[PDB]
Structures are given as structure tokens and as C-alpha cells.
């Protein structure tokens, strides 16, 4: 019902405001059933349509939105729907730099344990937010920690002491995105993604190490990617040249119960 | 917690030309450049290539070396200070012809090709780019005073003058100012070519310095002083 | 005192102009140039891009005319692309004009030596390592390498030791010519540097580090 509410139900009602209580309860649903934890994500789309059509409000909207971001969001099939709405939410002009910094930091932290399809979504999303809000660029890089050849020996010592005393101030348990101290933190996770096993995903993460010449990235070209699509994408490519082989030789493919390719496994 | 610049993309430093006078700059003046043309086809007169012809002209072949002028431009143009857009070069022919050197130019590294430019420049009075977008070498109106910055400091390279440290010199000078260096491209001669217009003359090293060596030494100090790197 | 390869104790600034494109061709043996001899080099099969002794001539002039050379703290070695090692006596005064420089250079490779009446230019036996001082630091000019201050670099190095810089006189090429001998590669300027300017930069710093003035 919540999937089709925004399109196939609400437009056909005279007074769709009567669905406020149903949608608001769905958006605030908290249950011991794990499978019900995805209900608020779906209710958000229908809720916003009512918000948009009749100038209605949800109290503490961004704090609730910040809470909903969780590792489960990265894995649900409805990530594409959620991120489409989230861009509209974080495209507002009255959003604090700290507010957006917490969203960027939390998503990047989740990317450490996310599938490549989700990574393909988050990277251009973070690129747009930082480009929208240049104050968040300090997270990608802190100039105070850069070493200059001309800096005096006293400056070198002061730089060393600063490198001795730093602590990451980002709090993962704070529920208010304006108090997580993410802006003072750093996107030390996104650097890891540049070593992602897939070549294309790693190349996307390499953009943060490159100048931000591009004005924005179109999310619709990165949102609805799946494991099947990525596999189908590679299988299309033709073998122009034979694949490279391995010079090293292994006597036994698996371990026993000289050289073993896979220690710890046996026939 | 000083905030970052909004745009951190690398941006090409401006090309500094005679029209802009406010900006702090180093101006290297290659005074008494031996650059002359004569029909044999016009060729740049040289100390070695044209000895009999210059004798007919009555001019001594000792002061007939455009090679020195060529080398000074190479080291000056190739210097990192030029790459940072903080240096502009002027050349004063011994005959009295003043040449403005656009910092963007790339003179040929071979001398013979360089001579082909000088006859082209001296006769056509201007040189254009491969893409036809900017004039790189343009002859300009004397005196040299008007083309230079409104507020600027003037020195010549004098072996007899006291030895100074160029880095310590540029540091103690002001910032809105600019520094102009008169380098004598001559093989030998009295250091009074710029005496009319300069305020003082300084020595760079106690040993004699070639024009190519001296100008390179002077500019490196500005890069250290101005942190051009 | 005039520094020589025989003496190794004295601290000195060694500069090696690696991959010098110096070759003699007879149609009489004349130094090859990228533009003077294009068809002849084409018949030879060698690219005319790497056929420029002008860069090598320019590096020698700034190196020899630098104040440090006047102070007797610099000796120059040249490694030809063909594999010929040339020792350049500090006392030598090479011609300012390139044409006379070329005429000298054909004399040196065929006669293997230039005399005055000590050898100003002598061809010597490879490897360069034997000629170099016993205790010495080796570095190369690498654009990709981290940028370092030459003045701070020489200051932090020891005193009894000596410093070698393997400068590539190439117009273009991979910076791996001296990787076999050197132990590290350092960047001098974040911007690209010509061979002539880079050695001029390096000698300027040493004059400040050692107070040659």
C-alpha cells in the first residue's frame, strides 16, 4: 500500500489529507519486527507528497531523517527511492554546514560495509553535497596538517605536536545531526573506497583526490544499479586479447587433511 | 579555524603585461642587447658568422653576440618565477630599440631559429602566436620608464658595487613596490648604460658573473623570498 | 685547488648530466643536431627529438660559470646517451657559441682527450661510481618526487660527504637513467624544470648552504 500510495492512491482522493495520520504513524513506526523497520522509508515518499501539496509539517524532520539512515538502508532494495527524496531534502538553502557534514560523515561511515551498488550511489551524492556546501570541503582535507618546505623549524615542531594530540571528534551515537561534531572530523573512510576491488567503483572514489571541476553529478545515472546489472555490463565486453595467466605454480589446489593455493580448505 | 577558499581548483596565474602596473613584479632589463639585421637576405649579425660584414659596418665584432641575449631569455623565461606569473622581461637593443617580452612566449632553444625571430621582430615590429590570439614580442616606445610599474625599485648589476644578498634585499623592500634589475648583456663594457634612470647599483657576487648566471641567481632569490617555489 | 676524480676526501658538488645526446657523424665527423641533421639522423634510425646537444651545452655553461665553480667546489661529469663518460675539468672555459662547442666536441670523442699547451676534457671509463667520492650522496631530479629545499637539504647532509645530482639533459624521457646508482630521487620545484635551470637552482642553494657567495 505504501509503495503505490504516492502515485496510485493519493491523486485519486478528494481530501488526501485524511492519510496524514496513517502516513505519520507509518513514518514513526518502531517495532520489534525487523521486517517492519523498512516501513518509515516507504512512508516518507507518501508523506512528502502531502507535505508538498497542502503546506503541512512534520516536527523535527531532519533529526528523524538522520536517524533513519542506518546500515539496513544501504542493503534494502528501496535505497534508490530513499536517495531520490534525500537529495530534495538536502538541496534546501537553509541547512547548516554541520547538519550536512553529519549526513556526509554518516553515509561515508556506512560505505565501509555497503555493496558496490550502494557505493555507486553514495559517492556522487557526497560529491554534490560538498559542491553545494564548500564549507564541508574541510572534511576532505585539513590544510593545517599539510607540511610546507619553507615552514620554519619551530613550525615543524608545532605541526608534530598537533599530529600527536589529534582525536577524531565524530560521535556515532548522537542523534542530533547538529551536535555530532562531524564538521571537525574527516572523511577518512572515503579514502579506503579508492582501493575498492572493482575498478569502476575505485575510479569514482578517486574523484575526491581530484579537482572539483564538475558542477554536479546526475544521480539518475548512478541510483538504480544492482549486482545483476554490473555483471551484465562486464559480460558484454568482448575478448580482444587473451587473459593473462599466472607464472607461479601450485601443487595442490586445496590443503590436505608442497604449495597450496587455498590453505584451510580440504576436499 | 580560518575557513577554506570556496574554489580550490588550480587557477592559472594571470599573464602580467605592461598595462598592469599595480601588481608586485620582478622586471629583468637586458640592457645593451646586440641585435642588428643586415641584407646579405636579412640575418641577425653575429660575432662569428658575420665578421667581414661587421668590419665593413665599422662595428667591433667583440660586441656582436646575440647569443648572450638569447641565453638570458632562456634562463629567465624558463625560471619558475616566470611560471608563477611574477616576472616580465624587457630588452634594450644597443641601437636604442626597446622590446617587450610577453611572459607566455617560448623562444626556440636553438640559436639559429632565435635569430630568425629577431629579424622577423625587428622588421615586422611584432610577433604573433601559433593560434593567433596574442602578440608575444612587441617593440615598444622608449623611454623604459613609462612601461614599468608606477612604484618600483631599480638596481643594476655592478661588479664594482658592494656585494649584497638578493634574498635579504628583496625581503627588506616593500610589497606594493616592484623590483627592476638591469642586466648588461654585453660581453664587456662600462656599467653606466642605465645610470641615468636607476637610483643605485648593487653587486651580486664577488667573483665576476655572466649575464645568464647573474639573472638566474637574482630571480632564484625572489622565488625564495616570495616563496614562489 | 682544482678538484679531480683522483681526490675523494674533499667535499664537493658533483653534477652528472645524464643521457647527453652527443654523437659524431660523417657523410667529415660533425656533431649531430636535431635540426641541422634531420635526414642524416633518419638514415641513422635515431629520433631527431633526442638529438639536441644544445641543452647539454647550456647546462655546462651555467654549471661552469656558477660562482661555486669559481670557488673550486664543483666538478662535472657527462654521461652520453651512447654510453660515453666525460670528465669536465673545472678550469675549462667552453665556447659561448654552440657552433664552436660542437667543433670541440667532435675533437674530444675522436681524440678521446683535449689538451692545452691537465686535460680540460677527458673521456673516462664507466661506471661513474668509481670516479665518484668514497663517501657521497646521490640524488636525481624527479618531477614526480616530493619537492625539497636545496638549501635545507645540503645543510642537513654531513660535511665530509659529497653530493651528486644526476641531471637529465634529455628533452623528454623517463627519469630512470641513474636509478641503478642513486639511492633516492628528490623534487626541486613543483613546476617542471629545464636541465639548465634545475642545475642552476641547485648550485645557487649550495652557494648559500656553504656560504660560497
Amino acid at each position: 500500500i505504501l509503495l503505490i500510495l504516492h502515485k496510485r492512491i493519493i491523486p485519486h482522493f478528494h481530501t488526501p489529507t485524511k492519510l496524514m495520520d496513517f502516513l505519520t504513524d507509518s513514518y514513526n513506526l518502531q517495532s520489534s519486527n525487523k521486517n517492519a523497520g523498512v516501513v518509515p522509508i516507504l512512508a516518507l515518499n507518501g508523506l512528502f507528497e502531502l507535505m508538498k501539496r497542502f503546506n503541512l509539517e512534520y516536527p523535527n524532520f531532519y533529526m528523524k531523517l538522520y536517524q533513519i539512515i542506518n546500515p539496513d538502508l544501504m542493503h534494502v532494495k528501496y535505497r534508490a527511492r530513499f536517495f531520490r527524496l534525500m537529495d530534495v531534502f538536502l538541496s534546501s538553502t537553509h541547512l547548516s554546514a554541520h547538519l550536512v557534514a553529519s549526513f556526509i560523515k554518516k553515509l561515508a561511515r556506512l560505505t565501509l560495509e555497503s555493496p558496490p551498488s550502494a557505493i555507486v550511489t553514495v559517492i556522487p551524492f557526497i560529491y554534490n553535497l560538498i559542491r553545494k556546501h564548500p564549507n564541508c570541503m574541510i572534511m576532505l582535507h585539513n590544510p593545517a596538517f599539510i607540511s610546507n618546505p619553507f615552514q620554519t623549524p619551530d613550525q615543524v615542531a608545532n605541526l608534530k605536536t598537533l599530529k600527536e594530540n589529534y582525536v577524531d571528534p565524530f560521535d556515532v551515537h548522537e542523534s542530533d545531526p547538529e551536535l555530532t561534531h562531524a564538521l571537525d572530523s574527516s572523511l577518512w573512510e572515503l579514502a579506503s573506497l579508492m582501493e575498492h576491488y572493482h575498478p569502476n567503483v575505485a575510479t569514482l572514489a578517486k574523484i575526491f583526490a581530484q579537482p572539483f571541476k564538475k558542477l554536479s553529478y546526475n544521480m539518475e545515472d548512478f541510483l538504480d544499479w544492482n549486482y545483476d546489472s554490473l555483471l551484465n555490463a562486464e559480460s558484454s565486453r568482448k575478448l580482444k586479447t587473451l587473459p593473462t595467466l599466472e607464472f607461479e605454480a601450485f601443487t595442490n589446489v586445496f590443503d590436505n587433511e608442497g604449495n597450496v593455493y587455498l590453505p584451510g580448505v580440504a576436499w | 579555524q580560518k575557513a577554506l577558499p570556496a574554489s580550490l581548483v588550480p587557477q592559472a596565474p594571470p599573464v602580467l603585461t605592461s598595462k598592469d602596473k599595480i601588481t608586485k613584479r620582478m622586471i629583468v632589463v637586458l640592457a645593451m642587447a646586440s641585435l642588428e639585421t643586415h641584407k646579405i637576405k636579412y640575418v641577425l649579425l653575429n660575432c662569428d658568422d658575420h665578421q667581414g660584414l661587421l668590419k665593413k659596418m665599422g662595428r667591433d665584432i667583440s660586441e656582436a653576440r646575440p647569443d648572450i641575449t638569447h641565453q638570458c631569455l632562456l634562463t629567465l623565461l624558463d625560471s619558475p618565477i616566470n611560471k608563477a606569473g611574477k616576472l616580465q622581461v624587457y630588452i634594450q637593443t644597443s641601437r636604442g630599440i626597446l622590446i617587450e617580452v610577453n611572459p607566455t612566449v617560448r623562444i626556440p632553444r636553438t640559436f639559429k631559429r632565435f635569430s630568425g625571430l629577431m629579424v622577423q621582430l625587428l622588421h615586422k615590429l611584432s610577433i604573433r602566436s601559433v593560434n593567433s590570439e596574442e602578440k608575444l614580442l612587441k617593440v615598444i616606445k622608449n623611454p623604459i620608464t613609462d612601461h614599468l610599474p608606477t612604484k618600483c625599485r631599480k638596481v643594476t648589476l655592478s661588479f664594482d658595487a658592494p656585494v649584497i644578498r638578493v634574498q635579504d634585499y628583496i625581503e627588506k623592500l616593500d610589497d606594493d613596490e616592484s623590483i627592476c634589475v638591469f642586466v648588461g648583456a654585453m660581453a664587456r663594457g662600462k656599467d653606466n648604460f642605465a645610470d641615468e634612470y636607476v637610483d643605485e647599483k648593487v653587486g651580486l657576487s664577488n667573483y665576476p658573473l655572466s649575464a645568464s648566471v647573474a639573472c638566474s641567481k637574482f630571480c632564484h632569490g625572489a622565488e625564495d623570498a616570495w616563496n614562489i617555489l | 685547488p682544482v678538484l679531480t676524480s683522483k681526490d675523494k676526501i674533499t667535499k664537493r658538488m658533483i653534477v652528472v648530466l645524464a643521457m647527453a645526446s652527443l654523437e659524431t657523424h660523417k657523410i667529415k665527423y660533425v656533431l649531430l643536431n636535431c635540426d641541422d641533421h634531420q635526414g642524416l639522423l633518419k638514415k641513422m634510425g635515431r629520433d631527431i627529438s633526442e638529438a639536441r646537444p644544445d641543452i647539454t651545452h647550456q647546462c655546462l655553461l651555467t654549471l661552469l660559470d656558477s660562482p661555486i665553480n669559481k670557488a673550486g667546489k664543483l666538478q662535472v661529469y657527462i654521461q652520453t646517451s651512447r654510453g660515453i663518460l666525460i670528465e669536465v675539468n673545472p678550469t675549462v672555459r667552453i665556447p659561448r657559441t654552440f657552433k664552436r662547442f660542437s667543433g670541440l666536441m667532435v675533437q674530444l670523442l675522436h681524440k678521446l682527450s683535449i689538451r692545452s699547451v691537465e686535460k680540460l676534457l677527458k673521456v673516462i671509463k664507466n661506471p661513474i661510481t668509481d670516479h665518484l667520492p668514497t663517501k657521497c650522496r646521490k640524488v636525481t631530479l624527479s618531477f614526480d618526487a616530493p619537492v625539497i629545499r636545496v638549501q635545507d637539504y645540503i645543510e642537513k647532509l654531513d660535511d665530509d660527504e659529497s653530493i651528486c645530482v644526476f641531471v637529465g639533459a634529455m628533452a623528454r624521457g623517463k627519469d630512470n637513467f641513474a636509478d641503478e646508482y642513486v639511492d633516492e630521487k628528490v623534487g626541486l620545484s613543483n613546476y617542471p624544470l629545464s636541465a639548465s635551470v634545475a642545475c642552476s637552482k641547485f648550485c645557487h642553494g649550495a652557494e648559500d648552504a656553504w656560504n660560497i657567495l
Binding site: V120, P199, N200, T203, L204, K206, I207, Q210, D221, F222, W225, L230, A233 | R106, P108, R109, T110, R113, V130 | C34, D35, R52, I55, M170, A171, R172, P192, L193, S194, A195
Partner: peptide
């Protein structure tokens, strides 16, 4: 459109003017 296309532009961006001792073109 495809992710591979953006990667090629990114890689091409890294690879992407006379430099060093390069001379002006002959003719």
C-alpha cells in the same frame, strides 16, 4: 550513461602546453 564511461573520463582526466626543454614545432 554507463559507469564505465565516467571512469574513462576520470582516468583520462589524470592523463590530461610546452614543458621542460620541449622546443617549438618544426616546419
Amino acid at each position: 550513461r554507463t559507469l564505465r564511461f565516467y571512469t574513462s573520463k576520470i582516468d583520462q582526466q589524470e592523463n590530461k602546453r610546452f614543458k621542460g626543454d620541449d622546443d617549438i614545432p618544426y616546419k
